[PDB]
Design a protein around this ligand. Structure first.
Ligand SMILES: Nc1ncnc2c1ncn2[C@@H]1O[C@H](COP(=O)(O)OP(=O)(O)NP(=O)(O)O)[C@@H](O)[C@H]1O
Ligand SMILES: [Mg+2]
Lengths: 572, 584
């Protein structure tokens, strides 16, 4: 189970880039490892033997090697950059391509917040990881291993001092990580507490102020302030001791090299240049070992992005069109439910059950019930956003699982509870239902939606700017904007999920009265938790606790439908 | 990341002076660090000198009998160098943290005493990020960047001075790489900054497309907009691929370039040094010592250049924090008196108020409330019935006219007694992430839980509260997210009740409540108002009928008043609103 999708396929088409980056990096490493040996040659075979040519020609040769290694390093960065970037572009696309296909139930698993972070942050993390794999993940372990090779190449005996220098450093890194990890995580806990106290004081400032509890809040901020101070000292005191101890060990590396190497030159076994070359190789090996440690710290965090990204790539969309799905060139607006039962998660009792009702085309029906009766779910079944757990859902006497989704949804217009608009212009948003829609047709819809006058009073009007999510418009005008957007589609089924929340009670009737003259020949559902609104419709469908309680008019329901009485009692 | 523009300064010295005032109590300790950083940096430039000196004295003349003496001096020079780093580090650690602790304490105290208007003007997320980053910028520069910048100076000067006192020509040869370092860095820097922002632009657009499309997927599918959305993503993404490659290149070439300059220095020192050794002008150990300086003029220069930029960036943030600390505070008046135990008379006298002083919100509002009377201020959106609460709680102050309680002007009353004598249940009040028992106690600290449960029953809360996972001990994280809204309105009612004020403002929502709790919240409303004056932004039928007074608002103007039945007959505005909503 799970899925066999793999992120190592987004790099494959750039394998050339992915192999040139490390190769170019080795040239840099070889050129960087060459310098101390060429120096040792300058002193041992040049100065010691008195010949300028030696010193001169190898001096010139060290310059040439430096630039060669410079071409190496830039070439790695350039090539690793391409591979890195094309990877993230290809990754991101498929990630977005997947998310676009997700259903309510898919999104319900990877929550929408985590989904966004998975396509933004994790994509950059993975990009970085690939960049990293192709440059310093090649560089550092080559300097480390090559530096050891060189030291061994210069003098085997003196290399034994690496056996004494490397274990304490590795042990230092292991200790620092295993002790610093929960202490750094403790900072995040103490930071969030500071953030929470500040937020709740901003959020409910009028509460804390009116209740004369300001001083109690200063007290509660001190607790979060001190905890944060404490957890930061205790954690960083580790780092503040780790760095100097690392440098000390490295410096005793030098000591050991000059002392043990000192008794080697005395025995005529090692010239003076070789000691100079050895000190530099020594530092090379050590600092590289430090870089390797930091790489390890980033990989463990990086792989958490790999898993998260892979879960999205492995997720099958819950709603799928059948192979030979029916085409719907038109829809009458007949809408039926037969023994529909629905559940969101399989640990709870049903949110809909035994739902049986039908609606002839053209009719205006108010779906009415208290909070969490199941109205929004019930409506969500009509355009196949979710599927019945038991029973089925029909449109023009056809199971919706049998019809093309683009067709079915092309004939249904919904107006969701929470309203969402998209960046660009008002006219662009309103044409989401019809891109061939003329301005007259748009103004028409906006007039019925009682928003055309708000739009017309904007400096740019219909070409006014819609900001991300519709943040620059109030909840009232956004709702009306989407109602207009719903109507421009010219639907044969129209769902209005509680979309009178942010308007005047009077403006409400203006909208709904105009539908009758514009939804002429359109099955309309008007969802509400309040009776006055429901009375505008021809017939009232009453949901209570996930079941249908009654289906008729005010007089019938007031007599026979007890949940309708409870609503009436709570309102009048 | 690469800075965009240099921060404007309203006299940095004055803010510097002020910021240095936080360092005054720890002056003796701060001097001690500067000399530690000083000596530890000098001993750091001495090291490569001794390495050349050891070569020249111990190794070359084969005089190895002097080796344990030189290795003993080194071994202690090193030991002291790392001893000083640990001191310098751990001293500044609890020094700078002790400073930002003060700044955090002070800023939060400013929160509880600044006018409520600042929380209504700017978004809360903005004013926390901007503030907490500014505090971090100070923390960064104070505990790290300053002493690291100072060390960089002593080290750099220390190495040049000792270089020149050894050999002048070889010093000129080594310092030849400085103009190379500066020329290279400057060019790469501007490119990196350019494409950093060009990439940040395209990425923020692309991320924008992602965040909104995932949040509005349900709409995207309803409008079958998958392909068009996909096409909008592709063209941006394809352009991010192209720019991101460039940003990634220039942000990554400075290290191999700096490395090259190091290797170019190593080469020169080795060649020119070795060629000066072959004329007895310098020693071999001298060459070793200069190699020990060959990387002292690349990245440490850039570190200085960027530590200097963090300093500037810090001072700007310091300049922001000080201004927030300088904002005016809600103070009382010397003539403001404590409230006498009255029953609660409220009065408005031709009051005018707005928020931006351009568009008026309330215009000439004048009314009078009698102790005990339930009053319902009705009206559509754009009225100002909500704006009443703020003015009456003195969250804001009227421009024209005056508000007064029990005969004394509200502005001549201590805010303490005013806010104790007046209760408030806003439309969507705020809970705290504590326990239920603690939340209801928030109004009356000195109130036993035995008394609370006795009062919790008198508002229809005790039932569902004990039916919680941990009863009254239950922690409601994220401000009651796991509670239904109807249940939270109840908790707000129970809370306001325990404070027991003689004046009451109420905005009980009716929208998303279940019919069960709905009858119990209004029953709680009756026990809530039982005994006190009440003002209610009514949304219920059975409250505008029992109203001792209804005051109809419209467009910021008080238009109609009088009781329910009376206002139906006028056929003016109340009748409209009523029959256009209750005329079922
Ligand atoms: N996306 C979801 N995932 C899991 N559970 C859900 C989801 N949406 C709704 N529910 C639950 O399913 C039940 C029915 O939800 P829903 O149909 O939205 O109620 P509703 O009465 O239509 N909304 P409202 O009229 O605004 O109170 C409720 O108990 C919800 O808590
Ligand atoms: Mg709903």
């Amino acid at each position: 189970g799970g899925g066999s999708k793999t992120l190592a396929r987004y790099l494959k088409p750039y394998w050339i880039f992915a192999v040139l980056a490390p190769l170019f990096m080795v040239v840099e490493v070889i050129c960087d490892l060459s310098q101390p040996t060429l120096l040792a040659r300058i002193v041992d075979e040049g100065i010691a033997r008195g010949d300028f040519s030696l010193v001169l020609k190898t001096g010139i040769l060290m310059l040439i090697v430096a630039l060669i290694g410079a071409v190496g390093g830039i070439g790695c960065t350039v090539f690793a950059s391409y591979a890195s970037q094309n990877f993230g572009a290809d990754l991101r696309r498929d990630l977005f391509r997947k998310v676009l296909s997700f259903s309510i139930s898919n999104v319900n698993r990877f929550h929408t917040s985590s989904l966004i972070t998975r396509l933004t942050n994790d994509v950059t993390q993975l990009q970085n990881l690939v960049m990293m794999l192709l440059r310093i993940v090649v560089r550092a372990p080559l300097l480390f291993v090559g530096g050891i090779v060189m030291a061994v190449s210069i003098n085997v005996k003196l290399s034994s001092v690496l056996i004494f220098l490397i274990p304490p450093i590795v042990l230092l890194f292991v200790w620092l990580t295993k002790k610093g990890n929960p202490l750094f995580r403790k900072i995040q806990e103490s930071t969030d507490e500071v953030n929470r106290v500040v937020r709740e004081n901003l959020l409910g400032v009028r509460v804390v102020r009116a209740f004369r509890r300001e001083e109690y809040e200063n007290e509660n901020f001190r607790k979060a302030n001190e905890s944060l101070r404490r957890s930061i000292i205790s954690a960083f005191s580790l780092i503040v001791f780790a760095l100097p101890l690392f440098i000390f060990i490295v410096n005793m590396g030098m000591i050991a090299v000059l002392w043990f190497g000192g008794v080697l030159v005395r025995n005529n076994q090692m010239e003076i240049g070789s000691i100079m070359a050895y000190t530099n190789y020594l530092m090379q090996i050590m600092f590289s070992l430090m870089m390797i440690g930091n790489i390890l710290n980033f990989i463990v965090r990086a792989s958490a992005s790999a898993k998260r990204v892979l879960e999205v790539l492995n997720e099958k969309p819950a709603i799928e069109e059948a192979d030979n799905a029916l085409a719907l060139p038109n829809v009458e607006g007949s809408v039926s439910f037969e023994n529909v039962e629905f559940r969101y998660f399989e640990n709870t009792d049903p949110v809909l059950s035994g739902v049986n009702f039908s609606v002839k085309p053209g009719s205006l029906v108010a779906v009415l019930g208290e909070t969490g009766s199941g109205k929004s779910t019930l409506m969500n079944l009509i355009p196949r956003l979710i599927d019945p757990e038991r029973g089925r859902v029909e449109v023009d006497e056809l199971d919706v699982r049998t019809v093309k989704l683009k067709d079915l949804r092309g004939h249904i217009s919904a107006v969701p509870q929470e309203t969402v608009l998209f960046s660009g212009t008002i006219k662009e948003n309103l044409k989401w239902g019809r891109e061939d829609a003329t301005d007259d047709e748009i103004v028409e819809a906006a007039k019925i939606a009682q928003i055309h006058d708000f739009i017309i009073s904007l400096p740019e009007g219909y070409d006014s700017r819609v900001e991300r999510g519709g943040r620059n418009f109030s909840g009232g005008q956004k709702q009306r904007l989407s109602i207009a957007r719903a109507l421009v589609k010219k639907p044969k089924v129209l769902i209005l999920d509680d979309c009178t929340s942010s308007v005047d009670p009077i403006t409400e009737k203006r909208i709904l009265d105009g539908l009758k003259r514009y939804t002429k020949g359109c099955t309309t559902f008007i969802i509400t938790q309040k009776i006055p609104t429901a009375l505008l419709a021809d017939k009232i469908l009453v949901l209570h606790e996930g079941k249908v309680a009654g289906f008729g008019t005010h007089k019938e329901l007031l007599e026979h439908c007890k949940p309708y009485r409870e609503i009436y009692e709570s309102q009048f | 990341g690469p800075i965009l523009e240099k921060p404007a300064l309203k006299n940095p010295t004055a803010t510097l002076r002020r910021l240095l005032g936080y360092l005054r109590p720890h002056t003796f300790t701060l001097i001690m660090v500067f000399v530690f950083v000083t000596v530890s940096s000098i001993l750091g430039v001495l090291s490569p000198y001794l390495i050349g000196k050891t070569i020249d004295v111990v190794f070359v003349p084969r005089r190895f009998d002097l080796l344990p003496r030189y290795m003993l001096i080194l071994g202690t020079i090193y030991a002291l160098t790392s001893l000083l780093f640990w001191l310098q580090g751990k001293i500044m650690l609890t020094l700078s943290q002790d400073v930002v602790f003060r700044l955090r304490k002070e800023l939060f105290e400013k929160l509880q005493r600044v006018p409520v208007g600042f929380f209504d003007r700017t978004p809360h997320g903005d004013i926390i990020s901007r503030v907490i980053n500014d505090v971090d910028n100070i923390n960064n520069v104070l505990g790290n960047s300053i002493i690291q910048f100072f060390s960089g100076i002593v080290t750099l000067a220390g190495a040049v001075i000792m270089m020149f006192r050894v050999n002048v020509i070889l010093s000129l040869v080594t310092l030849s790489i400085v103009p190379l370092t500066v020329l290279i860095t400057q060019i790469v820097s501007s490119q990196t900054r350019k494409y950093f922002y060009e990439n940040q632009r395209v990425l923020g657009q692309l991320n924008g497309i992602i965040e909104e499309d995932i949040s509005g997927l349900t709409v995207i599918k309803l409008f079958t907009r998958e392909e068009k959305e996909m096409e909008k993503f592709d063209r941006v993404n394809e352009s991010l691929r192209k720019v991101g490659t460039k940003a990634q290149i220039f942000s990554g070439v400075l290290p191999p370039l700096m490395n090259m300059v190091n290797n170019l220095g190593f080469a020169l020192i080795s060649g020119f040094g070795g060629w000066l050794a072959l004329k007895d002008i310098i020693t071999v150990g001298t060459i070793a010592t200069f190699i020990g300086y060959s990387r002292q003029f690349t990245r440490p220069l850039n570190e200085l250049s960027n530590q200097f930029n963090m300093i500037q960036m810090a001072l700007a943030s310091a300049e922001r924090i000080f201004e927030i600390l300088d904002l005016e505070e809600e103070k009382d008046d010397p003539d403001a008196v404590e409230l006498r135990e009255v029953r609660g008379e409220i009065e408005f006298k031709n009051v005018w108020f707005s928020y931006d002083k351009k568009k008026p919100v309330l215009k000439d509002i004048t009314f009078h409330i009698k102790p005990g009377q339930k009053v319902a201020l009705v009206g559509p959106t754009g009225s100002g019935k909500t704006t009443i609460v703020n003015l009456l709680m003195r969250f804001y102050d009227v421009d024209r006219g005056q508000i007064l309680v029990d005969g004394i002007d509200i502005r001549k009353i201590k805010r303490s007694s005013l806010r104790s004598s007046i209760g408030i249940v806003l439309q969507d009040t705020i809970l705290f992430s504590t326990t239920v028992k603690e939340n209801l106690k928030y109004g009356n600290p000195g109130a036993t839980d035995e008394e609370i449960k006795e009062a919790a029953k008198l508002t229809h809360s005790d039932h569902f509260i004990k039916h919680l996972p941990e009863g009254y001990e239950t922690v409601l994280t994220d401000n009651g997210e796991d509670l239904s809204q109807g249940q939270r309105q109840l908790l707000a009612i129970t809370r306001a009740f325990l404070a027991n004020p003689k004046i009451l403002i109420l905005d009980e929502a009716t929208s998303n409540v279940d019919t069960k709790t709905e009858k119990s919240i209004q029953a709680a409303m009756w026990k809530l108002m039982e005994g006190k004056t009440s003002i209610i932004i009514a949304h219920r039928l059975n409250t505008i009928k029992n109203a001792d007074l209804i005051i109809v608002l419209r467009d910021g103007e008080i238009v109609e008043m009088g009781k329910h039945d009376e206002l139906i007959q006028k056929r003016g505005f109340y009748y409209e609103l009523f029959t256009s909503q209750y005329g079922l």
